[PDB]
Design a protein that fits this description.
This protein has 96 residues and is mainly α. The chain has helices at 3-20, 25-42, 56-64, 69-83. The chain has one domain (2-96). The chain has 4 helices and no strands. α1 (3-20) runs antiparallel to α2, α1 (3-20) packs antiparallel against α4 and α3 (56-64) runs antiparallel to α4. It binds chloride ion (3 copies). Residues 72-73, 76 line the site of one chloride ion. Pfam families: Tsi6 (PF18660).
Length: 96
């Protein structure tokens, strides 16, 4: 799995949930923070600074641990892989 696949998983679940709770500011905030992490992964010119301002882990615990554990887990996975630095990720060579 790549970090982006985790982000995209979380995003799909947030979108699914938004179909049920279209107004929910918490989900809308989560969607914004995921999209930002996604853009950071895709574009090096984008400043990585604001990553420290993200609250996805806190949101999962406070809002979804009880209510929606599938979403909670997905948000936590996405937050973690999103703040992991570039330099520690793993690479597979062809033929290996
Ligand atoms: Cl969890
Ligand atoms: Cl790290
Ligand atoms: Cl790793």
């Amino acid at each position: 799995m790549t970090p982006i696949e985790y982000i995209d998983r979380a995003l799909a679940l947030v979108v699914d949930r938004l179909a049920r709770y279209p107004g929910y500011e918490v989900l809308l905030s989560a969607e914004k923070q995921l999209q930002y992490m996604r853009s950071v992964l895709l574009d090096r010119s984008l400043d990585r600074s604001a990553l420290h301002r993200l609250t996805l882990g806190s949101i999962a615990v406070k809002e979804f641990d009880e209510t929606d554990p599938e979403l909670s887990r997905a948000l936590k996975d996405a937050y973690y892989v999103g703040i992991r630095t570039g330099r520690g990720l793993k690479v597979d060579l062809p033929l290996e």
